[PDB]
Write a protein that binds this ligand. Sequence first.
Ligand SMILES: [Cl-]
Ligand SMILES: [Mg+2]
Length: 306
Amino acid sequence: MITCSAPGKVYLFGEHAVVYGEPAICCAVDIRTRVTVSPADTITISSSLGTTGIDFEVHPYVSAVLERFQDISSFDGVDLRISSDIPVGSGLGSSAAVTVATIKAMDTLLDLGLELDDIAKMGHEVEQNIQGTASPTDTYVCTMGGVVLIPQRKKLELIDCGILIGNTNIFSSTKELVGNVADLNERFPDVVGPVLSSIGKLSVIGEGLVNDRDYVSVGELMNIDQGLLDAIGVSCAELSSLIYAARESGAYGSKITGAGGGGCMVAISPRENVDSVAEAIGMAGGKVVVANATDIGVRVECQLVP
Ligand SMILES: [Cl-]
Ligand SMILES: [Mg+2]
């Protein structure tokens, strides 16, 4: 019985602007997906969704990983179970965490000696196949953990304060939001162009402020980012409500994390304000997950000797 896990993640800065050549800063958080494997003669994949075989409708990311592995090492089958603390449809790197956890669990089952970089790359390839296109960001951060400046792929000082995630419970149509931004940029290139550049710049100045743990300043830049995301059309009233509530209850800052148009926001907060921010996000109608940043990336949690 092998159990491996991988964390979810938030963007401190830079969602929507990476595809335009701009830097970003992401942070792995301690809501994790666990994948447990044990040898069998048959493939079984059990989740909250149910038990299937290789099934690209119900379990696409796992099915892709298992395919990739049989192509480099034969296996009679595997009893594979998935547990996750990352809310479904939440937009916190769900698919990347399960992909990366599964790869590590299969690397372990079959002793293939994959390094982290290899795991991250195979992760990217898997998301690329399922999603049509994908950026290497999610699988890299979920593989490595900690605070990562993207795409330099540089580790930064872990966020030591409180992190709250507020879910609007509105599923974000990502491809649509990405496409609206590209269309808006095409219609108004000399307006939107600088807005996206401005988002990039938050990570240039933000890198240092994260390293000095100046979370007041980090929070202020996060608020600016939220406004810039609002400007390119990826926010909504539900996001805004949760975001302002977090700010009114003592957060350093708050903004969308990820695709926008619903999904989750994030707030960072002094530890003395965590309960008060959580409560305010709930009272504004969001579902709160209290997390902490984690320097722990993909990990073997269990490797039982029979
Ligand atoms: Cl899956
Ligand atoms: Mg992902």
